[PDB]
């Protein structure tokens, strides 16, 4: 229609044409479906300035059609002109699909020995902590922990417990939540032990943390090291209740083996 | 549910079938076929 | 405003002088308004009427240079000037025979959905005015009920020589349908019927057609033989593959309990 | 004046008692994507309100429901059910007390009243009814002067209900579908407000944007209600929007209401009429014809049939309309029995007399693409009738019996017939013979056994439709 006009070699008709496109885009969504190859060619022209805005409007039209996934790749390759917008229905559907791609990416990559991972692109992982900044602005903790488990990784999950005024009650039934949900033992126990790390970062000397990971992640040396903390501490409440918890709620082999340690 | 654009915009009823052969054709039928005896 | 760019209105293009000036001036229009996604104050639409007429002469220069995608692109531009959201525009002399030219190329290009949106984009005014609509749509009727009888006789009535260029394309869709519809569908025809319908009475053009059938001629005759061989039957392959359809019929017995 | 106080007190209270009190149960029946047993019932009574005795049809005292049910439009702890019972006892403002009319004058602060009363406790079809049923049963006043924007303001508070619909209750409202049903009918009232005088320039890009908000995420019945808007207003106001579909053609998952699916198939078949694709069109317009058996006795099924069967006449063959003739249709002469009478003839003078004499009714046809090839259909009907009658015929018979003035014009007609495959003829291009003939083997050797995969594919798909029917209870 008004898109075949681009046979000129100068790009200013192309910028005038996109100035027409975003103006009268509200009635002509089928015409770009024939201009898909022209979108590809104008995208693969580097020094031509409007490859990125072509990627924007291509995400728009392929969001109208149903090619949401090349809309997603075009949103990635649509420059900072894409990331400057995060307030719309369009943008919330496509960041839902974007961190959908990110979470299937992370669940795939999470079981790989030390590497050989697929390239997690920087845009889809930067909008992760941008949405965590939106969580901090909204001040909401459980939405922040939902996003913190969307990544299935300790990066922003570490940052939710790195916040200020994190009530250890909510952070402690977060352990309950993650106990009843996470399927593999590949990183559920890792979430457990990083929470007992952050509870050793808590100023009160915590023992519900070691009380739980001692009977799940079954550490024979951590009970000995908190016993050396008992040797330092010299209380009588210190050697009593966690002792009873492991003493009626651990393995028969476990305490009878570790008692000599 | 009935409208949606449209409110703005035995007899001979079975005999109509061969009456389509009676109206355009054969109205002086045995006035020519009855005269096939003596026309030739 | 640009006082008059068409100072050589009857001296359109003996060169590409005003064609380069036309690229520059259409680019000046592109710089100034942008196109017509604007409400307009109707004085910026006066140079849009000038833009209509210089895109008419740009269509004439595009058929002068034979750049048909730029021709039909400027033609789609002029149709968008008639798809322009204000009908309240001044009137040009070519206002309907541009639709006539669009109709004629649109019929020559073998697009019949484009033919019916041509008879549907502005339906009611196509019947009476502009005999360069009625003579093409009754010429479509002549293609419907009696073609190869009125083509040259219709070329004999175009006083406005811009329609013979596109009924040369219609002569091409005449000659290919000769090449598909006088041999390899009949029995035999003699040389004088091909001499009448295939004009100039022995070019390498009707010789090109006679050999384009994949066939060798004799003297003073054109047989249309050696076709539809073997009486084909497709021996037992549907018997096999429709049992391979009965396979997923058993799968339809499977998917239900 | 004593008989018109009992009746609205009865019927309007049986409306909203059932409506509100059952929609409460329908939205506290935590999951219901199908149930909606008072939603479609209230739609069956609001289409009946358009027959019946409106919100108030200025019913001979003051028209008082309009200063009644939108005041204190607040559904608190169930003493507001007693507020609605106070709106039952207060129905005799017309007969007992001082009569105040507040239609068309104080309805605008009444349109401000569902917000001026306290927070909506997640029952929007009561407020959707309060944004539709005041002024859209006042479209039947037909004045449409300075109340066009008033009815449009009632639909602006419908747009406030879309704000509270898909900008509020972010956990699975499921009256989103009921409000799709209500919003569809009030989009046809957007039609009945703008399209009386303008087009819906709001709802052009908002037709596409309401398709956007009901594309995949909460799309149920919204898709083809909006697509019937998309495929109905985009017929009179022009075309290639049907070609704007052709790269994003998407229909329902499951077929909807039978009338809805029927008229939708009718719209797309009528679009394929101007596309001149005659293969899919005949079966989908037959489906649409038999699938809408319920119509008002003034007609509208003969309307749908009238504008249906024209391309079926243009097929080259069509059954006789001796199964559709209606007397008011006989007086209105809508599909012209005389036209298909002349189709069965090879007559030209009476057929073009139908044309020239009845161009006044061709105005109501508006489908003038019929004639320029329907004359061709007349001459093809003649040659089809003759060549189907005769085994062998020559040009000397038919080329001058149908006065084609020449052998070769009938040779071109038979050439286009063989190009259509209708006749199996041959032309002796030596003496001037059509040495016509007929093909052989009309026996059931190879053809019906291959057509039985269509027959039995039909059968097994109806088996699977029976299976999916079995799947719902």
Polypeptide structure, described:
- The structure is cut from a larger assembly and holds chains A (about 260 residues), B (about 40 residues), C (about 260 residues) and D (about 475 residues).
- Helix content of chain A is about 65%, strand content about 0%.
- Chain A has about 260 residues and is mainly α.
- Chain A is elongated, with a radius of gyration of 27 Å.
- Chain B contains two helices and no strands.
- The termini of chain B are far apart.
- Chain C has about 260 residues and is mostly helical.
- Chain C is about 55% helix and about 0% strand.
- Chains B and D meet through helix 1 of B and helix 12 of D.
H-E order of chain A: HHHHHHHHHHHHHHH
Helix-strand makeup class of chain A: mainly alpha
Quaternary structure annotation: part of a larger assembly
Beta percentage of chain A is under 5%
Quick overview:
Chain A has 15 helices and no strands. Chain A has 261 residues and is mostly helical. The termini of chain A are far apart.
Attribute tags:
part of a larger assembly; 4 chains; A: 261 residues; mainly alpha; 15 helices; elongated; C: 257 residues; two-stranded antiparallel sheet; 11 helices
What order do the helices and strands come in, and which of them pair?
This is part of a larger assembly, with chains A (261 residues), B (40 residues), C (257 residues) and D (473 residues).
Chain A: H1 12-24, H2 36-43, H3 51-65, H4 68-76, H5 80-83, H6 89-109, H7 122-138, H8 142-150, H9 154-160, H10 168-179, H11 188-200, H12 208-216, H13 220-233, H14 241-248, H15 252-258
Chain B: H1 16-23, H2 36-39
Chain D: H1 6-28, H2 39-49, H3 79-89, H4 107-116, H5 124-132, H6 148-166, H7 176-194, H8 202-212, H9 222-230, H10 233-236, H11 242-245, H12 258-274, H13 278-291, H14 301-306, H15 310-313, H16 327-332, H17 337-344, H18 349-357, H19 359-365, H20 371-389, H21 395-401, H22 407-419, E1 427-428, E2 433-434, H23 447-470
Antiparallel strand pairs in D: 1-2
């Amino acid at each position: 229609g008004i898109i075949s006009l681009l046979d000129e070699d100068e790009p200013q008709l192309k910028e005038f044409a996109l100035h027409k496109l975003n103006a009268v885009v509200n009635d002509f969504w089928a015409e770009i479906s024939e201009s898909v190859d022209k979108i590809e060619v104008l995208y693969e022209d580097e020094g031509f300035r409007s490859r990125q805005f072509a990627a924007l409007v291509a995400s728009k039209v392929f969001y109208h059609l149903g090619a949401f996934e090349e809309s997603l790749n075009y949103a990635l390759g649509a420059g900072d002109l894409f990331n400057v917008n995060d307030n719309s229905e369009y943008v919330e559907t496509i960041i839902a699909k974007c961190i959908d791609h990110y979470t299937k990416q992370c669940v795939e990559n999470a079981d790989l020995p030390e590497g050989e991972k697929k390239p997690i692109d920087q845009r889809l992982e930067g909008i992760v902590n941008k949405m965590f900044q939106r969580c901090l602005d909204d001040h909401k903790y459980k939405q922040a922990i939902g996003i913190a488990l969307e990544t299935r990784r300790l990066d922003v999950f570490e940052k939710t417990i790195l916040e200020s005024n994190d009530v250890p009650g909510m952070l402690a039934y977060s352990l309950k939540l993650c106990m009843s949900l996470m399927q593999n033992k590949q990183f559920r126990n890792k979430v457990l032990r990083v929470l007992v790390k952050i509870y050793m970062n808590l100023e009160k000397p915590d023992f519900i943390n070691v009380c739980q990971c001692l009977i799940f992640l079954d550490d024979p040396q951590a009970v000995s090291d908190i016993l050396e903390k008992l040797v330092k501490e010299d209380n009588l409440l210190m050697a009593y209740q966690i002792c009873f918890d492991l003493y009626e709620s651990a393995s028969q082999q476990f305490l009878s083996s570790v008692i000599q340690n | 549910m009935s409208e949606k654009k449209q409110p703005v915009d035995e007899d001979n009823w079975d005999d109509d079938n061969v009456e389509d052969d009676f109206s355009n054709q054969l109205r002086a039928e045995l006035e020519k076929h009855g005269y096939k005896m003596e026309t030739s | 405003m640009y006082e008059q760019l068409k100072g050589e209105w009857n001296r359109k293009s003996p060169n590409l002088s005003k064609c380069g000036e036309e690229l520059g001036r259409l680019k000046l229009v592109l710089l100034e308004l942008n196109f017509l996604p604007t409400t307009g104050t109707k004085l910026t639409k006066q140079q849009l009427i000038l833009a209509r007429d210089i895109l008419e002469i740009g269509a004439q220069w595009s058929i002068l240079r034979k750049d048909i995608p730029s021709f039909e692109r400027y033609m789609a531009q002029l149709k968008c000037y008639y798809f322009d959201y204000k009908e309240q525009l001044p009137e040009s002399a070519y206002m309907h025979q541009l639709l006539g030219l669009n109709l004629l190329f649109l019929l020559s290009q073998n697009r019949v959905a484009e033919f019916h949106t041509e008879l549907e984009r502005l339906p009611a005014k196509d019947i009476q005015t502009n005999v360069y609509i009625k003579h093409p749509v009754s010429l479509e009727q002549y293609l419907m009920e009696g073609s190869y009888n009125k083509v040259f006789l219709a070329k004999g009535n175009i006083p406005a020589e811009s329609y013979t260029f596109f009924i040369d394309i219609l002569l091409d869709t005449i000659r290919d349908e000769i090449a598909g519809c006088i041999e390899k569908a009949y029995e035999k025809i003699l040389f004088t019927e091909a001499t009448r319908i295939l004009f100039f009475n022995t070019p390498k053009k009707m010789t090109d057609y006679a050999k384009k059938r994949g066939w060798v001629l004799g003297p003073n005759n054109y047989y249309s033989f050696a076709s539809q061989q073997q009486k084909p039957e497709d021996t037992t392959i549907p018997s096999t593959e429709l049992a391979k359809q009965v396979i997923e019929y058993a799968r339809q017995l499977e998917m239900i309990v | 004046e004593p008989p018109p106080p009992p009746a609205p007190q009865d019927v309007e209270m049986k409306e909203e008692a059932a409506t509100g009190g059952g929609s409460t149960g329908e939205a506290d029946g935590k999951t219901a994507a199908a149930a909606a047993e008072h939603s479609q019932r209230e739609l069956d009574t609001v289409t009946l309100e358009d027959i019946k005795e409106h919100v108030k049809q200025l019913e001979k005292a003051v028209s008082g429901k309009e200063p009644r049910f939108v005041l204190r439009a607040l559904r608190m702890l169930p003493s507001t059910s007693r507020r609605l019972n106070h709106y039952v006892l207060y129905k005799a403002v017309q007969g007992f007390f001082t009569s105040n009319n507040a239609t068309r004058d104080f309805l605008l602060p009444f349109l401000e009243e569902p917000m001026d009363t306290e927070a909506d406790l997640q029952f929007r079809p009561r407020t959707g009814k309060a944004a539709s049923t005041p002024l859209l049963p006042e479209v039947e006043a037909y004045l449409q002067l300075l109340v066009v924007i008033f009815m449009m303001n009632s639909k602006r508070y419908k747009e406030a209900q879309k704000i509270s619909d898909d900008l509020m209750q972010k956990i699975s409202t499921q009256n989103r579908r009921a409000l799709d049903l209500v919003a569809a009918k009030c989009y046809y009232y957007h039609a009945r407000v703008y399209e009386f005088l303008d087009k819906l320039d709001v709802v052009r890009s908002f037709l596409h944007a309401r398709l956007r908000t009901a594309t995949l995420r909460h799309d149920a019945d919204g898709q083809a209600t909006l697509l019937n808007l998309l495929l109905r207003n985009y017929l009179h106001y022009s075309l290639y929007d049907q070609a704007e579909k052709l790269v994003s053609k998407s229909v329902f998952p499951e077929q909807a209401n039978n009338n809805e699916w029927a008229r939708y198939l009718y719209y797309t078949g009528r679009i394929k009429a101007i596309q001149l694709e005659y293969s899919e069109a005949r079966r989908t317009m037959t489906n649409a014809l038999r699938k809408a058996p319920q119509h008002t006795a003034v007609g509208f099924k003969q309307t749908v049939h009238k504008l249906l069967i024209v391309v079926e006449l243009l097929l080259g063959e069509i059954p006789d309309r001796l199964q559709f003739r209606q007397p008011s249709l006989k007086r209105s002469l809508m599909p012209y029995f005389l036209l298909t009478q002349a189709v069965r003839t090879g007559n030209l003078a009476k057929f073009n007399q139908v044309l020239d004499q009845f161009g006044e009714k061709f105005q109501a046809d508006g489908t003038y693409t019929l004639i320029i090839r329907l004359r061709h259909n007349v001459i093809k009907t003649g040659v089809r009738m003759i060549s189907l009658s005769y085994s062998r015929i020559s040009l000397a018979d038919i080329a001058q019996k149908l006065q084609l003035d020449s052998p070769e014009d009938a040779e071109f007609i038979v050439a286009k017939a063989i190009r259509d495959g209708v006749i199996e003829a041959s032309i002796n291009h030596e003496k001037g013979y059509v040495q016509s003939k007929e093909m052989i083997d009309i026996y059931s050797t190879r053809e019906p056994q291959l057509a039985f995969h269509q027959r039995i594919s039909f059968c097994l798909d109806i088996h699977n439709m029976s299976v999916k029917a079995m799947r719902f209870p």
